């Protein structure tokens, strides 16, 4: 047998490499540069025609299997990591591309949350997945994902990128280099997603709960006269060479707060753990609480894990969660690989198990016969 390849198709970035390795070999933006198109189209797009999606995935998988990885597709197996409740037609297409065009031996559709649990070694743990599109949580108890007690909110990368763009356009101060030393607002109508992502990573950080709670009430201005903490210094960011955008200190520590803002509904990234944990079985409560896992690149943002764990323990004392989750000890697990590449590492650890892989995985001979991929929906 040969070392099975692991792929993990995401909206922002795709993880690729081989099984039984310390981390992924290639990690790249999930896009393709088609002739005529100035900006490259995104390879994973939900709610489009199958033929157009088929062509994009055919183009992308080709780049992964030749330019990034150097190996024959037909020779060795595949371990496709994809999140639970991934759209039906997308997963059906992705398999149909691998089985028909590339003619792979067998694909294994592992849920990202159960794979993240294997990397630690613990059999039972709560898993939060703060991705690009949606920040999803799914309790895993001793190998069994509990779909009953699922939770998701659109407070990921996309929702954060959009919030940054909005704030920058309000307090817009750019030095074009054409008598634009004076503050010039909205010279460009929209900012490209590639720039916004680079600003987010380098400039913006996650504030402490004490400082963050003041920032929330400050921008609200709820019958108070200038009750904001002192912001960090303003950082100057180059746009397309000559144009120098002066990023305000307030924007850096306020953009993140949309994730941890209550917004009346009581629906934050913090609340989603406690909302799910309260809905879980009464016996499983204390085991899941003690074993928390925080995967996804959105949680890589500096000082996110401290704010989350703090915001949890504050929301615990709130009267809604005070009865059930009152006297619970919330402890976070530190996975071996980085927060972005926890999902991938599980699939590699699973891919190294050649004996179990072949049995669980769906063979091409079965797919060609039936034409029915197994899912958590009815058969």
């Amino acid at each position: 047998e040969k070392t099975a390849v692991v792929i993990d198709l995401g909206e922002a970035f795709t993880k690729c490499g081989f099984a039984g390795e310390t981390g992924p070999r290639c990690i790249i933006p999930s896009v393709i540069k088609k002739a005529g198109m100035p900006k490259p189209i995104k390879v994973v797009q939900y709610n489009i025609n199958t033929e157009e999606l088929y062509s994009y995935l055919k183009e992308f998988i080709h780049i992964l299997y030749f330019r990034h990885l150097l190996v024959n597709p037909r020779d060795r197996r595949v371990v496709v990591i994809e999140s639970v409740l991934c759209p039906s037609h997308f997963r059906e297409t992705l398999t149909r591309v691998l089985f028909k065009y590339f003619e792979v031996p067998s694909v294994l559709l592992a849920p990202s949350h159960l794979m993240a649990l294997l990397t630690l070694g613990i059999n039972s743990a709560m898993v939060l997945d703060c991705g690009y599109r949606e920040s999803l949580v799914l309790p895993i108890y001793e190998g069994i994902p509990v779909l009953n007690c699922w939770g998701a909110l659109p407070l990921g990368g996309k929702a954060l990128h959009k919030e940054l763009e909005t704030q920058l356009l309000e307090q817009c101060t750019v030095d074009t280099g054409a008598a634009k030393e004076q503050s010039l607002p909205s010279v460009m109508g929209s900012i490209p997603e590639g720039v916004l992502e680079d600003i987010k990573v380098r400039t913006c950080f996650v504030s402490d709960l004490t400082r963050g709670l003041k920032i929330q009430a400050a921008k609200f201005n709820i019958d108070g006269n200038t009750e904001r903490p002192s912001p960090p210094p303003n950082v100057d960011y180059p746009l397309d060479g000559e144009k120098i955008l002066h990023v305000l200190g307030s924007i850096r520590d306020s953009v993140v707060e949309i994730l941890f803002e209550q917004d009346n509904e009581e629906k934050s990234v913090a609340t989603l753990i406690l909302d799910s944990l309260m809905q879980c079985p009464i016996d499983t409560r204390k085991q899941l609480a003690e074993n928390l896992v925080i995967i996804g690149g959105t949680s890589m943002l500096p000082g996110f894990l401290h704010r989350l764990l703090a915001e949890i323990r504050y929301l615990v004392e709130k009267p809604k969660y005070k009865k059930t989750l009152g006297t619970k000890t919330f402890r976070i697990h530190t996975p071996p690989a980085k927060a972005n590449c926890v999902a991938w590492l599980g699939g590699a650890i699973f891919g190294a198990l050649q004996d179990i892989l072949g049995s669980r995985s769906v063979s091409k001979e079965y797919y060609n016969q039936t034409g029915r991929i197994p899912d958590w929906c009815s058969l």
Binding site: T22, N72, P73, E103, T119, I349, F350
Partner: protein
């Protein structure tokens, strides 16, 4: 190919999937009678090579070395093939003036043999988990 606009007049392929492609890109199949596209045809892997120091490596050596050249290096700041400069050797880029001295990597007495990448921090924990799951899978 590009100077003359070959991407204008296109030839059609017969089969399941119909595609409009330039004749320059397409291939004729002699075994039968039907020209087929770069898309339609199946791709294989023959040989691996480094784009800087053109050295044909075997398939077995690539798997051990993780599809990389030992001698050649690419700069991290910008994506370009580095060059060894002496004073006793330091690695420097031509496009950007990023040096190996900047990050604080010590100069090596031997040219190529001395340079190395540090071992992965969670490599020991990795093998222990594989062997546990391997026994459990068995």
């Amino acid at each position: 190919a590009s100077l003359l606009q070959s991407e204008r007049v296109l030839y059609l392929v017969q089969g399941e999937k119909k595609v409009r492609a330039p004749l320059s890109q397409l291939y004729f199949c002699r075994y039968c009678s039907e020209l087929r596209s770069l898309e339609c045809v199946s791709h294989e892997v023959d040989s691996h090579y480094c784009p800087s120091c053109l050295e044909n490596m075997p398939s077995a050596e690539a798997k051990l070395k993780k599809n990389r050249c030992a001698n050649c290096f690419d700069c991290p700041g910008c994506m370009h093939t580095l060059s060894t400069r002496a004073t006793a050797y330091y690695l420097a880029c031509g496009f950007c003036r990023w040096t190996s001295r900047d990050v604080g990597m010590a100069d090596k007495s031997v040219a190529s043999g001395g340079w190395q990448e540090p071992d992965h921090p969670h490599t020991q924990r990795m093998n222990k988990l594989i062997e546990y799951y391997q026994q459990l899978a068995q």
